[PDB]
Ligand binder design. Structure first.
Ligand SMILES: O=c1[nH]c(=O)c2nn[nH]c2[nH]1
Ligand SMILES: O=c1[nH]c(=O)c2nn[nH]c2[nH]1
Ligand SMILES: O=c1[nH]c(=O)c2nn[nH]c2[nH]1
Ligand SMILES: O=c1[nH]c(=O)c2nn[nH]c2[nH]1
Ligand SMILES: O=c1[nH]c(=O)c2nn[nH]c2[nH]1
Ligand SMILES: O=c1[nH]c(=O)c2nn[nH]c2[nH]1
Ligand SMILES: O=c1[nH]c(=O)c2nn[nH]c2[nH]1
Ligand SMILES: O=c1[nH]c(=O)c2nn[nH]c2[nH]1
Ligand SMILES: [Ar]
Ligand SMILES: [Ar]
Ligand SMILES: [Ar]
Ligand SMILES: [Ar]
Ligand SMILES: [Ar]
Ligand SMILES: [Ar]
Ligand SMILES: [Ar]
Ligand SMILES: [Ar]
Ligand code: NA
Ligand code: NA
Ligand code: NA
Ligand code: NA
Lengths: 295, 295, 295, 295
């Protein structure tokens, strides 16, 4: 037996950081959960009880906090690059650092029409994420995402013309509900290293903002032929708005809302154009996925 | 042995309703989760296998959907009243209906700064709830609430002057983070029946709105002496702003964010006035409750 | 306004304790999660910012760990009694301590058919819980329970003879699946204080054991007329088997498994006597509650 | 823009099946949750609103149930092969079917020392899983796993001799608690197709049983130098007990239990050899991973 792959590190490290401004007395809060896993010359920790090669998970945890103290934690693509870079440079035998960050929302409250200096609400469970893979002499690979963006539209979604065979019972429809939790991911052109990441910093926030705006617009506006068809259109527009993106990937549950036939009860009319009351189905769910690239 | 108490029915009934305004084309969606439990002369179903007294849970589920088709599902206080009244009126032997409703958020999307006619986002897992107890002979008892409203302020929270003895290690502070998940409940004066509830319908949405607005402003503006002191201020203000409320209750976790001493590492200064990076603590948590009434 | 009711303290305190028998080398582990909330002359902390009356939640957490070090953590009824008594005795102005304990399973592993001295498996998320209310002047009130015990029988459950009207669609059955998550609670007779609780210690583990054994056997053997009828039988048997119990309560979801009509596909026969494949329904669920006492 | 990859299907399909024996009157229950996603000539459903190529998720759901009716659902490696095979053979344009199955525990109850014919308990939240990738003209790739097997040992785990630098605070130890949730996966030699899978059926259950036995034994018995070192030993033994396995992969959280220093309180002694009461840490957690193969 031989180790074919191994990585190890610290997961679920919660981090908060505050910035306090001088002139303004305005405060800004940032909260994330971090995972850093390491690869390199570590097989012997597995094979020969040889702990000498292990940078302790505990130490990795310390290093996340220290790093957060020493640098801005925003945007997470930068923070993750910085953090990941630290590990491969500091330790000879460590050849890759994989950093996952989930950013939690803390949105400034408006009180009596004006933004509060130091009070925040978690205004959605929606997250902003990165996966930052820092690989020694292979550069920095970044995937940015939004996830947990839960949306519904009450009309202007259709699904007809699919294969019908001896397995099919689904009725065609020209007017249904569409609901999903959006998980959208954009993969950056490889960066040669930390310096290169630093040259692009403003694009990170801008491309997140774009991806979200494009998701919501296309979802709201598209008289959708299918989930397949609507996600495609979103991805097209995202690629067309940022050249440093190689691929855009959506993963979309179809969270079904069934009509309820009430006609058995006093001829109550609640289907087709009369449909008002629906039963949201917790399971199962359609799951539709797509990765889109340049020709 | 004897039955001392008994209730039964259907829990976790998901319900969506859509309104379509045919003039404007604007749709509005409502989604909830409903529990109905019944009490009455039902002891024999437990003692003698007498199913003749059971309105089947399956039937209670049908009834929920039927009632939602036949009536507005909003405000939940009204819907719950209507649903519970149905059971005590329809079935001679049923003497109480206990209706719990959790309302889920579907906030109309703004696309390019105008509200979209039929697209919605779940902005946060905050809920608005009611518990409506319809009791034959004893009118309609309603408790409304909001829950899962998660907030944080980065400053203007203090906690000093608490008891200190051989069990105490907590340092006094004049500047700490305060973060909670707000569960606030207002108990209505007893209503004589459906007719009286229908006559106060506007007060429901307005008292909810007040409860939320006070919570948010008080949390944001109060320079807090404790969770105890700040939650009292919210409750007193809510009572003063709606006469038909008898009590306000808050239940508030103290979601601790601990300073991290980084001084062991390169003399890093991260405590007291220099604290910027903190460790959010998932558990344990303080929990602080109050019920506030009129003197 | 005035405070009508108030309690506060520390929730979600995780506690592990190990016993080591130095003769045998056998270790036993216990793990729980503890909540302590206090009542007393504490109104001024809410009304006047008087922190002098607050035993800090942080201190209550310290106290939990200290008490667990100084005493057996088992049975939970005893531990809870000891912990709650500490608060009402130590602090003049605290008049009640409400102690909730959830005990987690760590079952000793069998390796090659002998029990291992110091290795354990979490066999299921079933819990054993207590709520111990220590009230100055009014003794010690204990409710014990078991919760999260998930069971299913594939046959020997019936449900016919229920009311049928214009709201009913459920077909009668003489053979259906029955599945539940058992939450069962036994309320102890009031104890005068710690001394009396200590004098009945063996009755705790034995009454838990009885409660579980009866639940399991009755569920397995009863040819059930309803959830109502079967849960009553459990409760009556538990009361008859421990005199110091005043009430037994059950709360039981009916976790529905629906037949699937496959006849549209190749005449496939999957209903009634031919039913083998079923669709477990996540929601909604029947919910059936009883409290049973002595006549 | 062009689709670079796409798959779609039905997720979270719950399935129960019962077998009833003639001679014995013994019943056996099986419960799983199924996901099937499809690949093939489907890009046009994304790019050209062309639903003609879509086998409806609804239909895929039907097909899971029908398949379950027509075949044993055990072992899941076979069921998944059968189900996946169905899709690539039935539909010309579908070239791969990816089947994930999670098997839920329903363990026969012993009542009064004898196994009950038709009553079952969910005796752990531990799962048995497969991922079955059926790829047209590439055969059937199977990965089997167990997950959610939560274990703790109170002693006979060590962690010393790791790198110490300016980032390290962790103390070395020769006696600690070790707790983890085991996620162990074994990847089968590629099978050429359904016929080949059928020739190996008994090995599926045997290899699952082996993997579990080996995990628990090695965990209980190994005076572990590190998580890294203990997982390695498990994987070694698994490979050495079944030739049709190419690789074994473990992913193991280190669920930390901290000592609690109580000496500040009355010189209470609770560390090193005196350590009895520990604080279980919900987060963060060490995460250690390893894939092991034949030389
Ligand atoms: O077993 C362990 N492996 C590690 O890599 C580690 N780091 N901190 N503690 C640890 N324990
Ligand atoms: O109302 C329904 N719509 C569907 O799409 C469906 N599929 N299975 N059952 C169903 N019921
Ligand atoms: O606001 C607070 N209330 C309390 O009762 C407390 N105890 N510790 N910290 C605390 N903070
Ligand atoms: O930084 C800390 N603050 C606290 O209030 C506390 N209580 N336990 N440990 C602690 N650490
Ligand atoms: O056991 C049952 N009790 C009920 O009250 C019921 N209602 N529908 N099905 C049911 N099954
Ligand atoms: O098969 C079913 N059984 C039921 O009891 C039921 N109730 N609603 N739909 C149902 N389908
Ligand atoms: O948008 C959809 N895509 C599908 O593949 C599908 N299958 N059933 N319903 C569906 N809706
Ligand atoms: O008791 C502790 N043990 C540890 O391993 C540790 N790491 N950070 N803090 C800690 N406290
Ligand atoms: Ar952060
Ligand atoms: Ar979509
Ligand atoms: Ar609704
Ligand atoms: Ar507060
Ligand atoms: Ar414990
Ligand atoms: Ar039952
Ligand atoms: Ar199954
Ligand atoms: Ar391990
Ligand atoms: Na390196
Ligand atoms: Na009545
Ligand atoms: Na007292
Ligand atoms: Na094919």
């Amino acid at each position: 037996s031989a180790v074919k792959a191994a990585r190890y590190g610290k997961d679920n490290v919660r981090v908060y950081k505050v910035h306090k401004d001088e002139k303004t007395g305005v405060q800004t809060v940032y909260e994330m959960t971090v995972c850093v896993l390491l690869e390199g010359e570590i097989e012997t920790s597995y094979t020969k009880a040889d702990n000498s090669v292990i940078v302790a998970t505990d130490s990795i945890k310390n290093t996340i906090y220290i790093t957060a103290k020493q640098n801005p934690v925003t945007p997470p693509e930068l923070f993750g690059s910085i953090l990941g870079t630290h590990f491969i440079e500091k330790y000879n035998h460590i050849h890759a650092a994989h950093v996952n960050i989930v950013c939690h929302r803390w949105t400034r409250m408006d009180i009596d029409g004006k933004p509060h200096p130091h009070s925040f609400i978690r205004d959605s469970e929606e997250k902003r994420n990165v996966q930052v893979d820092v690989v020694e002499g292979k550069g920095i690979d970044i995937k940015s995402s939004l996830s947990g963006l839960t949306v519904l539209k009450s009309t202007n979604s259709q699904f007809w013309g699919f294969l019908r065979d001896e397995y099919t019972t689904l009725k065609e429809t020209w007017d249904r509900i569409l609901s999903t939790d959006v998980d959208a991911t954009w993969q950056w052109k490889n960066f040669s290293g930390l310096q290169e990441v630093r040259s692009h910093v403003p694009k990170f926030d801008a491309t997140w903002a774009t991806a979200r705006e494009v998701t919501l617009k296309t979802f709201a506006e598209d008289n959708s032929a299918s989930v397949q068809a609507t996600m495609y259109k979103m991805a097209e527009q995202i690629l067309a708005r940022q050249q440093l993106i190689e691929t855009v990937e959506y993963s979309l549950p179809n969270k079904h809302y069934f009509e309820i036939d009430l006609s058995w009860h006093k001829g109550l009319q609640n289907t087709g154009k009369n449909a008002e009351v629906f039963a949201p189905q917790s399971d199962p769910n359609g799951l539709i996925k797509c990765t889109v690239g340049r020709s």
